[PDB]
Amino acid sequence: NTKYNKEFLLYLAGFVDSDGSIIAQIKPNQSVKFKHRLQLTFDVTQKTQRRWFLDKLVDEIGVGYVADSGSVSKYRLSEIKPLHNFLTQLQPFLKLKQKQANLVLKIIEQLPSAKESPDKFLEVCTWVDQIAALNDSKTRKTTSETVRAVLDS
Amino acid sequence: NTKYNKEFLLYLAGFVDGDGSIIAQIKPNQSGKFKHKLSLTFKVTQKTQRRWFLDKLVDEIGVGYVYDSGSVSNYYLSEIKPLHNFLTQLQPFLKLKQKQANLVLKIIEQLPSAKESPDKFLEVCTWVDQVAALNDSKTRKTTSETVRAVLDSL
Protein backbone atom coordinates (compact mmCIF):
# COMPACT_ATOMS: atom_id res chain seq x y z
CA ASN A 1 0.00 0.00 0.00
CA THR A 2 2.24 2.80 -1.29
CA LYS A 3 0.99 6.39 -1.05
CA TYR A 4 1.06 8.78 -4.01
CA ASN A 5 1.79 12.52 -3.95
CA LYS A 6 -1.11 14.90 -4.61
CA GLU A 7 0.57 16.79 -7.46
CA PHE A 8 1.42 13.53 -9.22
CA LEU A 9 -2.21 12.43 -8.94
CA LEU A 10 -3.44 15.82 -10.20
CA TYR A 11 -1.46 15.81 -13.46
CA LEU A 12 -2.08 12.11 -14.04
CA ALA A 13 -5.84 12.42 -13.51
CA GLY A 14 -6.00 14.95 -16.33
CA PHE A 15 -3.99 12.62 -18.55
CA VAL A 16 -6.27 9.67 -17.72
CA ASP A 17 -9.46 11.65 -18.39
CA SER A 18 -8.04 12.41 -21.84
CA ASP A 19 -6.06 9.46 -23.23
CA GLY A 20 -6.54 7.01 -20.36
CA SER A 21 -9.07 4.22 -19.98
CA ILE A 22 -10.77 2.42 -17.09
CA ILE A 23 -12.05 -0.90 -18.42
CA ALA A 24 -14.22 -3.59 -16.87
CA GLN A 25 -15.01 -6.70 -18.89
CA ILE A 26 -16.57 -10.14 -18.51
CA LYS A 27 -14.44 -12.90 -20.01
CA PRO A 28 -15.61 -16.41 -20.99
CA ASN A 29 -13.72 -19.06 -19.02
CA GLN A 30 -15.10 -22.59 -18.70
CA SER A 31 -12.62 -23.66 -16.01
CA VAL A 32 -14.06 -21.11 -13.57
CA LYS A 33 -17.18 -21.61 -11.43
CA PHE A 34 -19.72 -19.74 -13.57
CA LYS A 35 -18.00 -20.13 -16.97
CA HIS A 36 -17.19 -16.40 -16.80
CA ARG A 37 -14.51 -14.27 -15.12
CA LEU A 38 -14.13 -10.59 -14.24
CA GLN A 39 -11.19 -8.49 -15.42
CA LEU A 40 -10.55 -4.92 -14.30
CA THR A 41 -8.02 -2.87 -16.26
CA PHE A 42 -6.46 0.57 -15.89
CA ASP A 43 -5.21 1.66 -19.29
CA VAL A 44 -3.12 4.55 -20.60
CA THR A 45 -2.51 4.68 -24.35
CA GLN A 46 0.26 6.50 -26.23
CA LYS A 47 2.12 6.01 -29.52
CA THR A 48 5.39 4.06 -29.25
CA GLN A 49 7.32 7.20 -30.22
CA ARG A 50 6.45 8.29 -26.67
CA ARG A 51 6.76 4.91 -24.95
CA TRP A 52 9.16 6.55 -22.49
CA PHE A 53 6.35 8.59 -20.95
CA LEU A 54 4.59 5.31 -20.20
CA ASP A 55 7.81 3.84 -18.77
CA LYS A 56 8.19 6.59 -16.15
CA LEU A 57 4.59 5.79 -15.25
CA VAL A 58 5.62 2.23 -14.35
CA ASP A 59 8.28 3.55 -11.98
CA GLU A 60 6.10 6.30 -10.51
CA ILE A 61 3.09 4.07 -9.85
CA GLY A 62 5.41 1.19 -8.95
CA VAL A 63 3.41 -1.66 -10.46
CA GLY A 64 2.19 -2.50 -13.97
CA TYR A 65 3.48 -3.32 -17.43
CA VAL A 66 3.78 -1.67 -20.85
CA ALA A 67 3.16 -3.40 -24.18
CA ASP A 68 3.49 -2.46 -27.85
CA SER A 69 1.02 -3.50 -30.55
CA GLY A 70 2.63 -1.77 -33.51
CA SER A 71 2.59 2.02 -33.51
CA VAL A 72 0.85 2.12 -30.14
CA SER A 73 2.13 1.36 -26.63
CA LYS A 74 -0.06 0.80 -23.57
CA TYR A 75 0.52 1.09 -19.84
CA ARG A 76 -1.62 -1.51 -18.09
CA LEU A 77 -2.59 -2.42 -14.53
CA SER A 78 -4.84 -5.42 -13.91
CA GLU A 79 -3.47 -6.60 -10.56
CA ILE A 80 -6.41 -6.28 -8.16
CA LYS A 81 -4.79 -5.07 -4.91
CA PRO A 82 -2.58 -2.33 -6.42
CA LEU A 83 -5.44 -1.34 -8.73
CA HIS A 84 -7.65 -0.71 -5.71
CA ASN A 85 -5.04 1.29 -3.79
CA PHE A 86 -4.25 3.37 -6.89
CA LEU A 87 -7.79 4.16 -8.07
CA THR A 88 -8.67 5.02 -4.46
CA GLN A 89 -6.02 7.75 -4.48
CA LEU A 90 -6.68 8.92 -8.05
CA GLN A 91 -10.50 9.00 -7.82
CA PRO A 92 -11.06 12.42 -6.19
CA PHE A 93 -9.26 14.19 -9.06
CA LEU A 94 -11.02 12.48 -11.96
CA LYS A 95 -13.53 14.74 -13.71
CA LEU A 96 -14.70 12.67 -16.67
CA LYS A 97 -14.01 9.07 -15.69
CA GLN A 98 -14.70 9.42 -11.96
CA LYS A 99 -17.91 7.35 -12.08
CA GLN A 100 -16.13 4.42 -13.74
CA ALA A 101 -13.34 4.49 -11.16
CA ASN A 102 -15.75 4.28 -8.22
CA LEU A 103 -17.72 1.60 -10.06
CA VAL A 104 -14.54 -0.48 -10.32
CA LEU A 105 -13.61 0.03 -6.66
CA LYS A 106 -17.09 -1.25 -5.86
CA ILE A 107 -16.48 -4.38 -7.95
CA ILE A 108 -13.04 -5.17 -6.51
CA GLU A 109 -14.45 -4.90 -2.98
CA GLN A 110 -17.37 -7.22 -3.79
CA LEU A 111 -15.07 -9.71 -5.54
CA PRO A 112 -15.08 -12.27 -2.70
CA SER A 113 -18.84 -12.21 -2.09
CA ALA A 114 -19.63 -12.47 -5.82
CA LYS A 115 -18.27 -16.00 -6.24
CA GLU A 116 -20.96 -17.22 -3.85
CA SER A 117 -24.42 -16.98 -5.42
CA PRO A 118 -25.28 -16.78 -9.16
CA ASP A 119 -27.70 -13.89 -8.57
CA LYS A 120 -24.95 -11.97 -6.77
CA PHE A 121 -22.48 -12.57 -9.60
CA LEU A 122 -25.00 -11.26 -12.13
CA GLU A 123 -25.49 -8.28 -9.82
CA VAL A 124 -21.77 -7.53 -10.13
CA CYS A 125 -21.89 -8.05 -13.90
CA THR A 126 -24.57 -5.35 -13.81
CA TRP A 127 -21.95 -3.02 -12.32
CA VAL A 128 -19.69 -3.96 -15.24
CA ASP A 129 -22.49 -3.06 -17.67
CA GLN A 130 -22.57 0.46 -16.21
CA ILE A 131 -18.84 1.01 -16.80
CA ALA A 132 -18.92 0.09 -20.49
CA ALA A 133 -21.99 2.31 -20.80
CA LEU A 134 -20.12 5.33 -19.42
CA ASN A 135 -17.23 4.48 -21.73
CA ASP A 136 -17.39 4.90 -25.50
CA SER A 137 -18.06 1.17 -25.94
CA LYS A 138 -18.05 -0.03 -29.55
CA THR A 139 -16.57 -3.54 -29.70
CA ARG A 140 -18.18 -5.13 -26.63
CA LYS A 141 -19.67 -8.63 -26.91
CA THR A 142 -19.91 -10.39 -23.54
CA THR A 143 -22.35 -8.57 -21.25
CA SER A 144 -24.38 -9.39 -18.13
CA GLU A 145 -27.19 -10.83 -20.25
CA THR A 146 -24.62 -13.01 -21.99
CA VAL A 147 -23.83 -14.51 -18.59
CA ARG A 148 -27.53 -14.80 -17.74
CA ALA A 149 -28.28 -16.84 -20.86
CA VAL A 150 -25.44 -19.27 -20.14
CA LEU A 151 -26.51 -19.24 -16.49
CA ASP A 152 -29.86 -20.65 -17.58
CA SER A 153 -28.88 -24.28 -17.02
CA ASN B 1 -3.71 39.76 -15.35
CA THR B 2 -5.39 36.58 -14.10
CA LYS B 3 -3.68 34.10 -11.79
CA TYR B 4 -4.74 30.47 -12.10
CA ASN B 5 -4.78 27.85 -9.34
CA LYS B 6 -2.02 25.24 -9.18
CA GLU B 7 -4.49 22.36 -8.85
CA PHE B 8 -6.26 23.63 -11.96
CA LEU B 9 -3.08 24.06 -14.00
CA LEU B 10 -1.82 20.65 -12.86
CA TYR B 11 -4.90 18.72 -14.00
CA LEU B 12 -5.36 20.70 -17.21
CA ALA B 13 -1.70 20.31 -18.22
CA GLY B 14 -2.13 16.55 -17.98
CA PHE B 15 -5.30 16.89 -20.05
CA VAL B 16 -3.46 19.09 -22.57
CA ASP B 17 -0.67 16.54 -22.99
CA GLY B 18 -3.48 14.02 -23.46
CA ASP B 19 -6.17 15.53 -25.68
CA GLY B 20 -5.00 19.14 -25.95
CA SER B 21 -3.11 20.87 -28.74
CA ILE B 22 -0.71 23.80 -29.07
CA ILE B 23 -0.63 25.13 -32.63
CA ALA B 24 1.29 27.75 -34.60
CA GLN B 25 0.05 28.67 -38.08
CA ILE B 26 1.16 30.82 -41.00
CA LYS B 27 -2.10 31.87 -42.65
CA PRO B 28 -2.08 33.21 -46.23
CA ASN B 29 -3.58 36.72 -46.17
CA GLN B 30 -3.47 38.95 -49.26
CA SER B 31 -4.32 42.09 -47.28
CA GLY B 32 -1.53 41.58 -44.75
CA LYS B 33 1.89 43.24 -44.71
CA PHE B 34 4.02 40.31 -45.88
CA LYS B 35 0.99 38.58 -47.43
CA HIS B 36 0.88 36.30 -44.39
CA LYS B 37 -0.92 36.26 -41.03
CA LEU B 38 0.44 34.58 -37.90
CA SER B 39 -2.02 32.82 -35.61
CA LEU B 40 -0.94 31.20 -32.35
CA THR B 41 -3.56 28.85 -30.93
CA PHE B 42 -4.34 26.82 -27.80
CA LYS B 43 -6.80 23.98 -28.41
CA VAL B 44 -8.57 21.34 -26.34
CA THR B 45 -10.63 18.79 -28.28
CA GLN B 46 -13.43 16.62 -26.91
CA LYS B 47 -16.53 14.69 -28.01
CA THR B 48 -19.52 17.06 -28.23
CA GLN B 49 -21.30 14.79 -25.74
CA ARG B 50 -18.77 16.19 -23.26
CA ARG B 51 -19.03 19.81 -24.47
CA TRP B 52 -19.81 20.93 -20.91
CA PHE B 53 -16.21 20.10 -20.00
CA LEU B 54 -15.02 22.53 -22.67
CA ASP B 55 -17.63 25.08 -21.59
CA LYS B 56 -16.23 25.22 -18.05
CA LEU B 57 -12.83 25.99 -19.57
CA VAL B 58 -14.19 29.31 -20.84
CA ASP B 59 -15.24 30.01 -17.25
CA GLU B 60 -12.10 28.79 -15.46
CA ILE B 61 -9.66 30.34 -17.96
CA GLY B 62 -11.82 33.45 -18.39
CA VAL B 63 -11.40 33.70 -22.15
CA GLY B 64 -11.60 31.53 -25.26
CA TYR B 65 -14.41 29.99 -27.28
CA VAL B 66 -16.02 26.59 -27.91
CA TYR B 67 -17.30 25.44 -31.33
CA ASP B 68 -18.46 22.26 -33.07
CA SER B 69 -16.95 20.21 -35.92
CA GLY B 70 -19.27 17.23 -36.34
CA SER B 71 -19.30 14.87 -33.37
CA VAL B 72 -16.39 16.87 -31.95
CA SER B 73 -16.19 20.20 -30.13
CA ASN B 74 -13.11 22.38 -29.68
CA TYR B 75 -12.02 24.85 -27.03
CA TYR B 76 -9.92 27.55 -28.68
CA LEU B 77 -7.86 30.51 -27.50
CA SER B 78 -5.94 32.63 -30.00
CA GLU B 79 -6.18 36.01 -28.27
CA ILE B 80 -2.54 37.09 -27.99
CA LYS B 81 -2.46 38.61 -24.48
CA PRO B 82 -4.45 36.17 -22.33
CA LEU B 83 -2.79 33.36 -24.31
CA HIS B 84 0.65 34.54 -23.21
CA ASN B 85 -0.55 34.90 -19.62
CA PHE B 86 -2.16 31.45 -19.67
CA LEU B 87 0.65 29.40 -21.21
CA THR B 88 3.20 31.21 -19.03
CA GLN B 89 1.53 29.64 -16.00
CA LEU B 90 0.60 26.36 -17.72
CA GLN B 91 4.06 25.63 -19.16
CA PRO B 92 5.88 24.51 -15.97
CA PHE B 93 3.51 21.53 -15.65
CA LEU B 94 3.44 20.32 -19.25
CA LYS B 95 5.53 17.25 -20.08
CA LEU B 96 4.63 16.19 -23.62
CA LYS B 97 3.97 19.68 -24.98
CA GLN B 98 6.28 21.98 -23.02
CA LYS B 99 8.62 22.75 -25.93
CA GLN B 100 5.64 23.85 -28.02
CA ALA B 101 4.49 26.23 -25.28
CA ASN B 102 7.86 27.92 -24.74
CA LEU B 103 8.12 28.43 -28.50
CA VAL B 104 4.66 29.99 -28.60
CA LEU B 105 5.67 32.28 -25.73
CA LYS B 106 8.79 33.09 -27.75
CA ILE B 107 6.86 34.07 -30.88
CA ILE B 108 4.29 36.14 -28.96
CA GLU B 109 7.02 38.11 -27.17
CA GLN B 110 8.89 38.91 -30.39
CA LEU B 111 5.66 39.58 -32.31
CA PRO B 112 5.63 43.39 -32.71
CA SER B 113 9.18 43.47 -34.11
CA ALA B 114 8.31 40.61 -36.46
CA LYS B 115 6.77 43.11 -38.89
CA GLU B 116 9.93 45.19 -39.28
CA SER B 117 12.11 43.29 -41.75
CA PRO B 118 11.42 40.22 -43.94
CA ASP B 119 14.45 38.60 -42.32
CA LYS B 120 12.98 39.12 -38.85
CA PHE B 121 9.61 37.78 -40.00
CA LEU B 122 11.12 34.75 -41.73
CA GLU B 123 13.02 33.80 -38.57
CA VAL B 124 9.75 33.89 -36.61
CA CYS B 125 8.28 31.71 -39.37
CA THR B 126 10.96 29.07 -38.76
CA TRP B 127 9.85 29.11 -35.12
CA VAL B 128 6.44 28.03 -36.37
CA ASP B 129 8.26 25.28 -38.29
CA GLN B 130 9.77 23.97 -35.04
CA VAL B 131 6.35 23.80 -33.38
CA ALA B 132 4.76 21.77 -36.18
CA ALA B 133 7.69 19.34 -36.11
CA LEU B 134 7.14 18.61 -32.41
CA ASN B 135 3.44 18.08 -33.09
CA ASP B 136 2.20 15.00 -34.93
CA SER B 137 1.94 17.15 -38.05
CA LYS B 138 0.05 15.63 -40.98
CA THR B 139 -1.92 18.03 -43.16
CA ARG B 140 0.26 21.15 -43.04
CA LYS B 141 0.71 23.32 -46.14
CA THR B 142 2.04 26.80 -45.40
CA THR B 143 5.57 26.81 -43.96
CA SER B 144 8.57 29.09 -43.47
CA GLU B 145 9.74 28.12 -46.95
CA THR B 146 6.32 28.99 -48.39
CA VAL B 147 6.84 32.55 -47.14
CA ARG B 148 10.41 32.64 -48.47
CA ALA B 149 9.07 31.84 -51.95
CA VAL B 150 6.46 34.63 -51.93
CA LEU B 151 8.76 37.19 -50.30
CA ASP B 152 11.86 36.65 -52.46
CA SER B 153 9.79 37.38 -55.58
CA LEU B 154 9.36 41.10 -54.94
Add this chain to the structure above:
DNA sequence: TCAGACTTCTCCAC
Protein backbone atom coordinates in the same frame (compact mmCIF):
# COMPACT_ATOMS: atom_id res chain seq x y z
C1' DT C 1 -4.62 46.27 -42.41
C1' DC C 2 -5.51 43.66 -38.56
C1' DA C 3 -7.02 40.50 -35.28
C1' DG C 4 -10.98 38.25 -33.39
C1' DA C 5 -14.81 35.41 -34.14
C1' DC C 6 -16.28 31.43 -36.51
C1' DT C 7 -16.41 27.10 -40.04
C1' DT C 8 -14.23 22.99 -42.52
C1' DC C 9 -10.79 19.10 -43.46
C1' DT C 10 -8.32 14.80 -42.47
C1' DC C 11 -5.28 11.12 -40.65
C1' DC C 12 -3.75 8.67 -36.86
C1' DA C 13 -3.50 7.99 -32.07
C1' DC C 14 -5.86 6.47 -29.55
Add this chain to the structure above:
DNA sequence: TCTGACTCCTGTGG
Protein backbone atom coordinates in the same frame (compact mmCIF):
# COMPACT_ATOMS: atom_id res chain seq x y z
C1' DT D 1 -9.05 -23.55 -10.62
C1' DC D 2 -7.90 -18.79 -11.22
C1' DT D 3 -5.04 -14.70 -11.45
C1' DG D 4 -2.24 -12.08 -14.26
C1' DA D 5 0.83 -11.36 -17.99
C1' DC D 6 0.50 -11.06 -22.79
C1' DT D 7 -1.34 -10.23 -27.85
C1' DC D 8 -4.71 -8.70 -31.23
C1' DC D 9 -8.63 -6.27 -33.28
C1' DT D 10 -12.06 -2.38 -34.20
C1' DG D 11 -13.90 2.39 -34.68
C1' DT D 12 -13.90 6.47 -33.61
C1' DG D 13 -12.47 10.90 -31.03
C1' DG D 14 -9.23 13.03 -31.01
Add this chain to the structure above:
DNA sequence: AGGAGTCAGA
Protein backbone atom coordinates in the same frame (compact mmCIF):
# COMPACT_ATOMS: atom_id res chain seq x y z
C1' DA E 1 -9.64 4.28 -26.36
C1' DG E 2 -12.05 -0.06 -25.52
C1' DG E 3 -12.57 -4.05 -25.92
C1' DA E 4 -11.59 -8.92 -27.79
C1' DG E 5 -8.65 -13.15 -26.87
C1' DT E 6 -4.70 -16.60 -25.38
C1' DC E 7 -1.74 -19.03 -22.20
C1' DA E 8 1.31 -20.63 -18.12
C1' DG E 9 2.20 -21.01 -13.57
C1' DA E 10 0.61 -20.91 -9.03
Add this chain to the structure above:
DNA sequence: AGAAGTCTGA
Protein backbone atom coordinates in the same frame (compact mmCIF):
# COMPACT_ATOMS: atom_id res chain seq x y z
C1' DA F 1 -5.19 16.43 -32.80
C1' DG F 2 -3.34 19.40 -35.98
C1' DA F 3 -4.15 21.71 -39.48
C1' DA F 4 -6.95 24.13 -43.43
C1' DG F 5 -9.90 28.17 -44.18
C1' DT F 6 -13.84 32.64 -44.36
C1' DC F 7 -15.65 37.00 -42.87
C1' DT F 8 -16.49 41.33 -40.07
C1' DG F 9 -15.87 45.36 -37.69
C1' DA F 10 -12.50 48.74 -36.29
